[PDB]
Amino acid sequence: PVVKINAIEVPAGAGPELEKRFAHSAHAVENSPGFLGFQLLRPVKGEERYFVVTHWESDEAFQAWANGPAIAAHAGHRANPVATGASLLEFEVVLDVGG
Amino acid sequence: PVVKINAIEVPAGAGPELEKRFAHSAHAVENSPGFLGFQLLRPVKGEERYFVVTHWESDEAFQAWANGPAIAAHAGHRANPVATGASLLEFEVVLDVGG
Numbered sequence: 001p002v003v004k005i006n007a008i009e010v011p012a013g014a015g016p017e018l019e020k021r022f023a024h025s026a027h028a029v030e031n032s033p034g035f036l037g038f039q040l041l042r043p044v045k046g047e048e049r050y051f052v053v054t055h056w057e058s059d060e061a062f063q064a065w066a067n068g069p070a071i072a073a074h075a076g077h078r079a080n081p082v083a084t085g086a087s088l089l090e091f092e093v094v095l096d097v098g099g
Numbered sequence: 100p101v102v103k104i105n106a107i108e109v110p111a112g113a114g115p116e117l118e119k120r121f122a123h124s125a126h127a128v129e130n131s132p133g134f135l136g137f138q139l140l141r142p143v144k145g146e147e148r149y150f151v152v153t154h155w156e157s158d159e160a161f162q163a164w165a166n167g168p169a170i171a172a173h174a175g176h177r178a179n180p181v182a183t184g185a186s187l188l189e190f191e192v193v194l195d196v197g198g
């Protein structure tokens with residue numbers, strides 16, 4: 001499996017506004033093939049970015065979502081971001097261990 | 100829940116030895132009170148560090164693991180480290196969405 005973390009830069013005080021924008025976004029990705037879940041992660045220490053952590057069965061499944069549904073899920077919204085920059089961090093899951 | 104990512108710098112070519120070390124490490128953390136699982140992530144693009152992504156009920160559950168078990172699990176291990184440095188990135192889970 002793969003992990004794609006989008007590391008997003010957020011201005012001082014904009015955390016609440018950013019999280020509200022994610023709060024009702026589940027529908028946009030929940031039913032994608034090969035999608036294994038995602039978390040919005042609020043930084044607390046050691047990092048200043050929000051980490052949007054997504055898990056996929058394969059890189060192909062991620063690309064498919066990113067190129068179609070993801071762009072479609074923008075239809076009603078403004079494209080005016082609170083985020084000041086972004087970096088996609090991409091990994092291969094080498095070991096996965098549960099509780 | 101909380102997420103603690105340890106971001107470890109690892110010289111090119113030591114990835115196999117490092118991954119081999121992690122392949123035999125589950126015993127050291129699993130069944131810890133409040134531990135919810137963890138992944139080793141090999142970097143692919145946008146990062147050169149391995150991300151050790153750990154999930155916990157609470158920060159206190161994480162600290163109790165780090166202050167006892169994690170230190171104890173070093174007893175007897177005569178290997179020299181292959182990692183070059185580490186930075187702890189600490190997060191709060193604001194949103195969790197499954198498949």
Ligand code: MNH
Binds near residue numbers: 021
């Ligand atoms: C240039 C690039 C770019 C810009 C300016 C951008 C901006 C935005 C803004 C602003 C919003 C907030 C809308 C709102 O008011 O709720 C939003 C939401 C969102 N966007 Mn994007 N977005 C991308 C790229 C961009 N998006 C990429 C790339 C992805 C993923 C592959 C993505 C995924 C989303 C999803 C998913 C939402 C949430 C949709 C929803 O709630 O319906 N997009």
Ligand code: MNH
Binds near residue numbers: 006018026029053085
């Ligand atoms: C991992 C893959 C991933 C990529 C490359 C991606 C990329 C982007 C880019 C680029 C931006 C614009 C940032 C800026 O600095 O202007 C953006 C915005 C956004 N994205 Mn996302 N995005 C996701 C995943 C991704 N997003 C997922 C999963 C969701 C949740 C359903 C989501 C939801 C959003 C929302 C909401 C915005 C608007 C953020 C803002 O207003 O700052 N997304």
Ligand code: MNH
Binds near residue numbers: 128180181
């Ligand atoms: C600071 C310095 C520091 C050094 C030099 C270090 C070095 C090592 C080396 C070398 C190994 C395994 C080698 C072998 O014999 O196969 C190892 C394993 C391990 N270490 Mn550490 N380690 C930490 C800190 C350190 N560790 C911290 C901090 C944590 C967590 C809070 C941690 C957790 C572990 C765990 C868990 C293992 C795996 C134990 C096992 O599989 O037996 N640690």
Ligand code: MNH
Binds near residue numbers: 104137
């Ligand atoms: C999250 C929290 C977390 C912290 C702060 C942590 C910290 C460290 C530090 C510091 C080092 C030494 C790096 C160096 O530069 O020499 C190290 C090494 C190590 N750690 Mn970990 N570590 C884990 C979690 C953590 N580790 C977990 C979970 C495991 C596996 C059960 C693990 C396993 C290792 C192994 C294996 C090593 C030895 C790496 C090597 O071979 O160089 N760990």
Ligand SMILES: [Cl-]
Binds near residue numbers: 006
């Ligand atoms: Cl994002």
Ligand SMILES: [Cl-]
Binds near residue numbers: 105107151
């Ligand atoms: Cl580590």
